[PDB]
Structures are given as C-alpha cells and as structure tokens.
C-alpha cells in the first residue's frame, strides 16, 4: 500500500552502519557490507539502498570512461 521508499544513498566506506525504517521499525545499529561486485546494499525497513562511492552502481549521472 505504501509503495515503500527506495532511498538511494552513496557512502564513502563499504560497511554502512544502518538502522531501519521508523523508530519502532528497527534502529538497533546494524552494519551492512556493500559488495564492489554490484555496488549497493538494501535495508528492507526504510528500503535504504546504499551505493558505494564511485562503484559501478554509481556509474549514473554522467560517464567518463578515461581515454
């Protein structure tokens, strides 16, 4: 019903100290590891999708591709 909330957030480190959705829906201090293999991790409470800084999942916005 709530269509949830895919909250994309780019982090500097791979292991992210997440919490959850609403106060009563998590927030116990949880650390999720972002795999460079894909570039993101999701927390099924607030649906916070953490993208790794500069990862292949962070290849949006605009390309560069070097020479």
Whole-angstrom distance, CA of residue 16 vs CA of residue 33: 6
Q: How was this structure determined?
A: NMR
Which of 7, 11, 9 has the alpha carbon at shortest distance from 45? Answer: 7
Domain ranges of the chain: 1-53
Say if residues 32 and 16 touch (Cβ distance below 8 Å): yes
Q: Please tell me the chain's helix, strand, coil percentages from 3-state DSSP, rounded to the nearest 5.
A: 5, 40, 55
In whole angstroms, give the CA distance from residue 52 to residue 36: 7
Helices (H) and strands (E) in the chain, counts: 0, 5
Neighbours of 52 (CB within 10 A): 22
Q: Which CATH class is domain 1-53?
A: mainly beta
Q: Which two tokens stand for residue 47?
A: 């649906």
Query: Could you give the CA distance from residue 12 to residue 42 in angstroms, rounded to a whole number?
Result: 16
């Amino acid at each position: 019903m709530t269509i949830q909330a895919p909250e994309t957030k780019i982090v500097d480190k791979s292991r992210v100290a997440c919490d959850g959705g609403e106060g009563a829906l998590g927030h116990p201090r949880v650390w999720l590891q972002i795999p460079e293999d894909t570039g993101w991790v999701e927390c099924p409470y607030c649906d916070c999708k953490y993208v790794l800084k500069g990862s292949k999942a962070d290849a949006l916005e605009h390309h560069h591709h070097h020479h």
